[PDB]
Amino acid sequence: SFIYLDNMAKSLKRAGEVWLSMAREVYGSEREVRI
């Protein structure tokens, strides 16, 4: 089952990339300002 799990991981990587690209337009950009 190793190859199936590796393919699942590499698909989840693309899913995470798509989510990261999509989230900027929904939740807004992040800025590091507290001082």
Partner 1 sequence: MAETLEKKHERIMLRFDRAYSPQKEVREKCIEATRFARVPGGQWEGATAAGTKLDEQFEKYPKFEINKVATELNRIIAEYRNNRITVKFRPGDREASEELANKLNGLFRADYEETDGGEACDNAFDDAATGGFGCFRLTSMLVRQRIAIEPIYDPSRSVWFDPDAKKYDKSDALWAFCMYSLSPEKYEAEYGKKPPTSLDVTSMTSWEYNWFGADVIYIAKYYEVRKESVDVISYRHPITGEIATYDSDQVEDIEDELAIAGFHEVARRSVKRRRVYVSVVDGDGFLEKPRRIPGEHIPLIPVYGKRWFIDDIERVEGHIAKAMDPQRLYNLQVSMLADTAAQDPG
Least distance in Å: CB of 3 to partner 1? 6
- Rounded CA separation 18/25 (Å): 12
Shortest distance in whole angstroms from residue 7 CB to partner 1: 5
CB of residue 15 to partner 1, shortest distance in Å: 5
DSSP the chain: -HHHHHHHHHHHHHHHHHHHHHHHHHH--------
Catalog residues that contact partner 1 under the rule CB under 8 A.
Answer: 1-23, 25-27, 30-33
